[PDB]
Structures are given as structure tokens and as C-alpha cells.
């Protein structure tokens, strides 16, 4: 609309100003989160006062295959969208790479989660929609499939805008990912787990796992207790294992709409073919009516966060 | 009492984190390497058990093991172990892409059994057997480290040790993968890794080189459905060789051999050869 293309084009303002990334231009500021695999940092661009993020990937990998990953990761400057992270420019030095992003003062919604216990329905509404655009953006623009949907991958601010990043558009970077440690649960539908990608219909799964688990603020595998849900350590191989054999998870009886309840249904179907797609999803019920009420998402994400209201 | 005051150690430059601890070039009489554990606190239960296993870890000495030089809870708990110039078979392989002859590939993998056959001998299962965990002393002997300390890589919950996993997940057996058939570390646990390792010797390659997804790797090798493809084997291998990397690999444990057989393999095939 006009304030997205305002916004749109605000930031590109603000990235031409901006020239090749070198590793003394930049003065850390604080540290923004961590996870199995990099570290992120809130950093000042000295050249051009900008302040950005900065994820530190550090691979073990030969220098052949990381040129490419730097020369991958520059399709990048092509995702514009208000549902794609902001991209400033990927570099390697110091034996690691840097991918520099614009900065989401609200952060993950995996952080959020925890500072609000639970997320209200009426937002998680707002959320379904911007994730629904964003791997709609990706898959029509640029044939790219996000890959990772998960709280931490969905980035918040306090302009209220809610954007997608760290998908998969490196295909480089993807094979060096997969010599990592085991982690200690999983966002994969069960066709990925036994075969490979189905479009988009396998980010969608992911989607409605997390929507579950922020709905109810825990990891949804496996399904909560009968007396844990009326207060409204399992292995890595097992959740795989109950994923692929075990019927999907479900909302809570009567805490959550009808209307949203069958959305998530809709999206943890363990065939990925009877599952929802994004045309589907985008005219659900659920997102209708999500779409048509006037929530104040900013200003519940400030409250949440313990910052004062904004605008 | 195997400890070490804070004030000895002179803790150096970080040079990395692996699945349990983060290495730094420390001084202490020398170079060390000062590895800082994730468990920052430990138990009173868990310290106790620690302390038991360095004493474990104290009276080992072999060509092929690195020297472990004790530990130090001082600011926060720590490995000392001896330092080592060069890389790690992992950059060696995967990394710098080296160059060996094959006649130093196979001596590479007859003294990594020379030093596995030595903590066997000693009842260690190193749990952590892979190619980042194996290095090359000037490059020349083969040095074997991050062996044993079961009781730091699972973290605790008072009296209670269970092995969450961790690790790279391309070396793990599949019993292992699965944790379920009891205590899922054993000798032959080691013996697939040590499998795996050949896989890396014989094509120059990781396992699983068409698999990019590190659930579906777990979910497949752990349910039996996933098995390192062995076509990958370079042309110019001893036949002789490929079968014993086979061996190793075998999905049920109970039929992979021990390492007194296993070294007897690669030194009779080490012998007729040239
Ligand atoms: N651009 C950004 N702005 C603000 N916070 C960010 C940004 N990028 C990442 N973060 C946060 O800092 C952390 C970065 O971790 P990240 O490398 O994405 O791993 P992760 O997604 O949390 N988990 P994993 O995928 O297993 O490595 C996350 O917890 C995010 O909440
Ligand atoms: N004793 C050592 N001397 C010199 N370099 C070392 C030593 N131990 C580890 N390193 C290096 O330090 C970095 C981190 O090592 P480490 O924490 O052991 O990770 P890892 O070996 O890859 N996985 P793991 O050993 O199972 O935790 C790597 O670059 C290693 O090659
Ligand atoms: C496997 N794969 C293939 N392409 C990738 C990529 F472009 C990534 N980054 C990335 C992407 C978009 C934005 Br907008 C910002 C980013 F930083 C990441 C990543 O960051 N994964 O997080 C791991 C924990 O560090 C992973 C990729
Ligand atoms: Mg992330
Ligand atoms: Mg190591």
C-alpha cells in the first residue's frame, strides 16, 4: 500500500549510502541473540551511521565452496518486500561470514513467546498473514523456498511490521549446514524427514507448528498432558520418530476459535499434497477475519516487551 | 586431585566451539589448549563424577592420544590438554584438500586403530570419534583427542547422567542416533565412527553428500533407511580395504568387529602392498 511503499522505499535510500562492507567499518554495540549455528550482533556502520544486525556464520568449510556461498547470498539485494527482512550486504573475513540485515528492534518471535508466555489468537492472526505473503514473495519472485520457518525466523519491530529471514537462498550454504550438531527439536514435516522438499506446502507445515506452539506457548511434539493443558525431555530421534508415525498436533478444545483451529489443522496435514497451499490459507476463514480486524500489534509487542507504548 | 588454580593458566586466542566447549590457545609450561565447557555450573554429584573420569584420563599415554593434562574449575570449568601445531584430519580432508598419497591415507587409518585399540584397551569409549577430533603431529603421527568425559557432554539434572546427544551427527552408529537400546555408547559405537572416518579416507568426501538436511540424515540413519553410499569410493582403494570399511558400518552393532581385529586388517594389508 502507501506506507509499505514509503517504507520499501526508505530503505533503499538508506542502502545506497552504503558501500562495500569491510570488517573495520563496523563498532558492536550489543549482542542480539545466539542460536547453533551463529551469532547475531546490533552493530553501527561507521561509513554511513546506519545500525544494522549482523549474523556471524562461522563454517569450517574450503574456500571454494564458501566464494560461492558470498556469491550466492547476493541475490539477497533482490528480496524486497515488507515480509522479507531487510539485506545490506554479505561478506566474508575473520573466518567467518558476516550477513549484515536491517535491524528488528522487537526481535524474534521465539523471544517474544517467552517474555509473553502465550501469543493471543487476534495476533497470531496478523502473523499468519505476513508469513503467508512472505513465502508467497519468495516463491513467485524468485522461485525460492524458505526452508526454516520457525518462531526464531520470523523478526518483529516496533513499526508493527512482521518479516521473514534466514530462508534458504543459498543452495550452497544449505550442503554446508547439514554437517551440524544435533539440535534439540524440529520445525520439519514429516516429507522432508523420509524425501525432499514439496514447494511451499512443506514451509506451510512449519507455519502451523509454530503457530501451535506460540498459541500455547510449548514445543507442540509431543501433544501437552491432560492435566498440563488444563494449566492453560524427550529425544531428538523420537520427535523425528513421532512426527513421521505419530497423527499430527492439534489446538486446544474451547480456548482457540473454530475458525482457527481448522487453519492449523489444515496445515499439519501429514501428506503434504492434502495439506493447504498458500492460495488456500490466503482466502481461509480464519485469515478473512484475522485481516479484517483492526489489531494494534505494535503497541501489544512494546507492552509485551516491557518498552513503552509507541507512535 | 588432578585441579589447576585460575592464576596458571594464561588463556590465549579462541579458536572455536565444538559440541561441548569452546577451545582457546592457552600457556600453561607450554602450549595448551584450554577447552571452557558448556556445563558452566556443575553438580556437587556431577563435579564428583568429573573428577573420577580426569583420573581416568590422567593415566592414559599413548603416541596416538592426546596428552590429557588435567582440568581447572577455577572461573569457570575447564580442559587442559596438550596443544597441537597443524590441522585436524577434518581440514585436511575437506579443507585444504591435501594430497596424500594413498600409502598415507592407509597409514593415517592404521595409527587411528593403533589409538582407538589403546582406549579400548583401557575400557574408554571416546563417544566423539570423527575426523575434527583427529590430528596430524607435523605431519606425521596421527594424535586422537576429545576421548571420553561422558559426564560433561550430557549435561545433569542432580544424580542423574543422560545423554541428551550431542556430537556431529555423520559419525554417529545408529543405535546411538536412536537412544534407546540402554547405554547406546559402546566399543562398537567407536567402531562405526571409526567406519565413518574410513568413508572420509577412501573418497575424499562426508558421508550423506546428496543430503542436505540434518533431521532427515537423523530421522533415516537412526530408522536404518540411511547408509553411507560406498560407490564413493575412490578407484585406486584396496579391495581389501572397502571391505573392512563395511564392516565397521554395520547397522546392528553386534556384527561390527573390535579394534584388535580391525588394526590386524590394515597392518596385513598395509604390508602386501607395494
Ligand atoms: N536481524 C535481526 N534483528 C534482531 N534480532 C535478530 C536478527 N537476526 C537474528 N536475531 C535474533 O538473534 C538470534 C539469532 O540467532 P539465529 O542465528 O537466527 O539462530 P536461531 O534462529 O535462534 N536458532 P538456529 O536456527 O537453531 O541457529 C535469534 O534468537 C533472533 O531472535
Ligand atoms: N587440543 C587442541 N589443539 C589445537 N586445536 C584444537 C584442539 N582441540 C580442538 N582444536 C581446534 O579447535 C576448534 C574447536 O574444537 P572442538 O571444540 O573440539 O570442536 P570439534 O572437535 O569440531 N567437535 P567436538 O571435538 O566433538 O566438540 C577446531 O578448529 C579444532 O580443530
Ligand atoms: C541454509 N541456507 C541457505 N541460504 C541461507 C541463508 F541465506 C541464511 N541467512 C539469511 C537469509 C536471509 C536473510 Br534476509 C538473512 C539471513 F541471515 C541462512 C541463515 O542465516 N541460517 O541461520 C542458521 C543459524 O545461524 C541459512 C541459509
Ligand atoms: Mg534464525
Ligand atoms: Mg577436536
Same mark, same amino acid.
Given at each position: 500500500?502507501?506506507?509499505?511503499?514509503?517504507?520499501?522505499?526508505?530503505?533503499?535510500?538508506?542502502?545506497?549510502?552504503?558501500?562495500?562492507?569491510?570488517?573495520?567499518?563496523?563498532?558492536?554495540?550489543?549482542?542480539?541473540?545466539?542460536?547453533?549455528?551463529?551469532?547475531?550482533?546490533?552493530?553501527?556502520?561507521?561509513?554511513?551511521?546506519?545500525?544494522?544486525?549482523?549474523?556471524?556464520?562461522?563454517?569450517?568449510?574450503?574456500?571454494?565452496?564458501?566464494?560461492?556461498?558470498?556469491?550466492?547470498?547476493?541475490?539477497?539485494?533482490?528480496?524486497?518486500?515488507?515480509?522479507?527482512?531487510?539485506?545490506?550486504?554479505?561478506?566474508?573475513?575473520?573466518?567467518?561470514?558476516?550477513?549484515?540485515?536491517?535491524?528488528?528492534?522487537?526481535?524474534?518471535?521465539?523471544?517474544?513467546?517467552?517474555?509473553?508466555?502465550?501469543?493471543?489468537?487476534?495476533?497470531?492472526?496478523?502473523?499468519?498473514?505476513?508469513?503467508?505473503?512472505?513465502?508467497?514473495?519468495?516463491?513467485?519472485?524468485?522461485?525460492?523456498?524458505?526452508?526454516?520457518?520457525?518462531?526464531?525466523?520470523?523478526?518483529?519491530?516496533?513499526?508493527?511490521?512482521?518479516?521473514?529471514?534466514?530462508?534458504?537462498?543459498?543452495?550452497?550454504?544449505?550442503?554446508?549446514?547439514?554437517?551440524?550438531?544435533?539440535?534439540?527439536?524440529?520445525?520439519?514435516?514429516?516429507?522432508?524427514?523420509?524425501?525432499?522438499?514439496?514447494?511451499?506446502?512443506?514451509?506451510?507445515?512449519?507455519?502451523?507448528?509454530?503457530?501451535?506452539?506460540?498459541?500455547?506457548?510449548?514445543?507442540?511434539?509431543?501433544?501437552?498432558?491432560?492435566?498440563?493443558?488444563?494449566?492453560?525431555?524427550?529425544?531428538?530421534?523420537?520427535?523425528?520418530?513421532?512426527?513421521?508415525?505419530?497423527?499430527?498436533?492439534?489446538?486446544?478444545?474451547?480456548?482457540?476459535?473454530?475458525?482457527?483451529?481448522?487453519?492449523?489443522?489444515?496445515?499439519?496435514?501429514?501428506?503434504?499434497?492434502?495439506?493447504?497451499?498458500?492460495?488456500?490459507?490466503?482466502?481461509?476463514?480464519?485469515?478473512?477475519?484475522?485481516?479484517?480486524?483492526?489489531?494494534?500489534?505494535?503497541?501489544?509487542?512494546?507492552?509485551?516487551?516491557?518498552?513503552?507504548?509507541?507512535? | 586431585?588432578?585441579?589447576?588454580?585460575?592464576?596458571?593458566?594464561?588463556?590465549?586466542?579462541?579458536?572455536?566451539?565444538?559440541?561441548?566447549?569452546?577451545?582457546?590457545?592457552?600457556?600453561?609450561?607450554?602450549?595448551?589448549?584450554?577447552?571452557?565447557?558448556?556445563?558452566?555450573?556443575?553438580?556437587?554429584?556431577?563435579?564428583?563424577?568429573?573428577?573420577?573420569?580426569?583420573?581416568?584420563?590422567?593415566?592414559?599415554?599413548?603416541?596416538?592420544?592426546?596428552?590429557?593434562?588435567?582440568?581447572?574449575?577455577?572461573?569457570?570449568?575447564?580442559?587442559?590438554?596438550?596443544?597441537?601445531?597443524?590441522?585436524?584430519?577434518?581440514?585436511?580432508?575437506?579443507?585444504?584438500?591435501?594430497?596424500?598419497?594413498?600409502?598415507?591415507?592407509?597409514?593415517?587409518?592404521?595409527?587411528?586403530?593403533?589409538?582407538?585399540?589403546?582406549?579400548?584397551?583401557?575400557?574408554?569409549?571416546?563417544?566423539?570419534? *570423527?575426523?575434527?577430533?583427529?590430528?596430524?603431529? /607435523?605431519? @606425521?603421527?596421527? =594424535?586422537?583427542?576429545?576421548?571420553? $568425559?561422558?559426564?560433561?557432554?550430557?549435561?545433569?539434572?542432580?544424580?542423574?547422567?543422560?545423554?541428551?546427544?550431542?556430537?556431529?551427527?555423520?559419525?554417529?552408529?545408529?543405535?546411538?542416533?536412536?537412544?534407546?537400546?540402554?547405554?547406546?555408547?559402546?566399543?562398537?559405537?567407536?567402531?562405526?565412527?571409526?567406519?565413518?572416518?574410513?568413508?572420509?579416507?577412501?573418497?575424499?568426501?562426508?558421508?550423506?553428500?546428496?543430503?542436505?538436511?540434518?533431521?532427515?540424515?537423523?530421522?533415516?540413519?537412526?530408522?536404518?533407511?540411511?547408509?553411507?553410499?560406498?560407490?564413493?569410493?575412490?578407484?585406486?582403494?584396496? *579391495?581389501?580395504?572397502?571391505?573392512?570399511?563395511? /564392516?565397521? @558400518?554395520?547397522? =546392528?552393532?553386534?556384527?561390527?568387529? $573390535?579394534?584388535?581385529?580391525?588394526?590386524?586388517?590394515?597392518?596385513?594389508?598395509?604390508?602386501?602392498?607395494?
Amino acid at each position: 500500500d502507501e506506507q509499505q511503499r514509503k517504507r520499501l522505499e526508505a530503505f533503499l535510500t538508506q542502502k545506497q549510502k552504503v558501500g562495500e562492507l569491510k570488517d573495520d567499518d563496523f563498532e558492536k554495540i550489543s549482542e542480539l541473540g545466539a542460536g547453533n549455528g551463529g551469532v547475531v550482533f546490533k552493530v553501527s556502520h561507521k561509513p554511513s551511521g546506519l545500525v544494522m544486525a549482523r549474523k556471524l556464520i562461522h563454517l569450517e568449510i574450503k574456500p571454494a565452496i564458501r566464494n560461492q556461498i558470498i556469491r550466492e547470498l547476493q541475490v539477497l539485494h533482490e528480496c524486497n518486500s515488507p515480509y522479507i527482512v531487510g539485506f545490506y550486504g554479505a561478506f566474508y573475513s575473520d573466518g567467518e561470514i558476516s550477513i549484515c540485515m536491517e535491524h528488528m528492534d522487537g526481535g524474534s518471535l521465539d523471544q517474544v513467546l517467552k517474555k509473553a508466555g502465550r501469543i493471543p489468537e487476534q495476533i497470531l492472526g496478523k502473523v499468519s498473514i505476513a508469513v503467508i505473503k512472505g513465502l508467497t514473495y519468495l516463491r513467485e519472485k524468485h522461485k525460492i523456498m524458505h526452508r526454516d520457518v520457525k518462531p526464531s525466523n520470523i523478526l518483529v519491530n516496533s513499526r508493527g511490521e512482521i518479516k521473514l529471514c534466514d530462508f534458504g537462498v543459498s543452495g550452497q550454504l544449505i550442503d554446508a549446514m547439514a554437517n551440524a550438531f544435533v539440535g534439540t527439536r524440529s520445525y520439519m514435516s514429516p516429507e522432508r524427514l523420509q524425501g525432499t522438499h514439496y514447494s511451499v506446502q512443506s514451509d506451510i507445515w512449519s507455519m502451523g507448528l509454530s503457530l501451535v506452539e506460540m498459541a500455547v506457548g510449548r514445543y507442540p511434539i509431543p501433544p501437552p498432558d491432560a492435566k498440563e493443558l488444563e494449566l492453560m525431555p524427550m529425544a531428538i530421534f523420537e520427535l523425528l520418530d513421532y512426527i513421521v508415525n505419530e497423527p499430527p498436533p492439534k489446538l486446544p478444545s474451547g480456548v482457540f476459535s473454530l475458525e482457527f483451529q481448522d487453519f492449523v489443522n489444515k496445515c499439519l496435514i501429514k501428506n503434504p499434497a492434502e495439506r493447504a497451499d498458500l492460495k488456500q490459507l490466503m482466502v481461509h476463514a480464519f485469515i478473512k477475519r484475522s485481516d479484517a480486524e483492526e489489531v494494534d500489534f505494535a503497541g501489544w509487542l512494546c507492552s509485551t516487551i516491557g518498552l513503552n507504548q509507541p507512535s | 586431585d588432578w585441579e589447576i588454580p585460575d592464576g596458571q593458566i594464561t588463556v590465549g586466542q579462541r579458536i572455536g566451539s565444538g559440541s561441548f566447549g569452546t577451545v582457546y590457545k592457552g600457556k600453561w609450561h607450554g602450549d595448551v589448549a584450554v577447552k571452557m565447557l558448556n556445563v558452566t555450573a556443575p553438580t556437587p554429584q556431577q563435579l564428583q563424577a568429573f573428577k573420577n573420569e580426569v583420573g581416568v584420563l590422567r593415566k592414559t599415554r599413548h603416541v596416538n592420544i592426546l596428552l590429557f593434562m588435567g582440568y581447572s574449575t577455577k572461573p569457570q570449568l575447564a580442559i587442559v590438554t596438550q596443544w597441537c601445531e597443524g590441522s585436524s584430519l577434518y581440514h585436511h580432508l575437506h579443507i585444504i584438500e591435501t594430497k596424500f598419497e594413498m600409502i598415507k591415507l592407509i597409514d593415517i587409518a592404521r595409527q587411528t586403530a593403533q589409538g582407538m585399540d589403546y582406549l579400548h584397551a583401557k575400557s574408554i569409549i571416546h563417544r566423539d570419534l *570423527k575426523s575434527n577430533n583427529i590430528f596430524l603431529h /607435523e605431519d @606425521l603421527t596421527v =594424535k586422537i583427542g576429545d576421548f571420553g $568425559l561422558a559426564t560433561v557432554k550430557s549435561r545433569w539434572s542432580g544424580s542423574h547422567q543422560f545423554e541428551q546427544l550431542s556430537g556431529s551427527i555423520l559419525w554417529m552408529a545408529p543405535e546411538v542416533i536412536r537412544m534407546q537400546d540402554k547405554n547406546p555408547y559402546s566399543f562398537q559405537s567407536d567402531v562405526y565412527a571409526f567406519g565413518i572416518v574410513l568413508y572420509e579416507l577412501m573418497t575424499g568426501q562426508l558421508p550423506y553428500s546428496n543430503i542436505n538436511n540434518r533431521d532427515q540424515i537423523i530421522f533415516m540413519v537412526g530408522r536404518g533407511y540411511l547408509s553411507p553410499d560406498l560407490s564413493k569410493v575412490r578407484s585406486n582403494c584396496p *579391495k581389501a580395504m572397502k571391505r573392512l570399511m563395511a /564392516e565397521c @558400518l554395520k547397522k =546392528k552393532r553386534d556384527e561390527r568387529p $573390535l579394534f584388535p581385529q580391525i588394526l590386524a586388517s590394515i597392518e596385513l594389508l598395509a604390508r602386501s602392498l607395494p
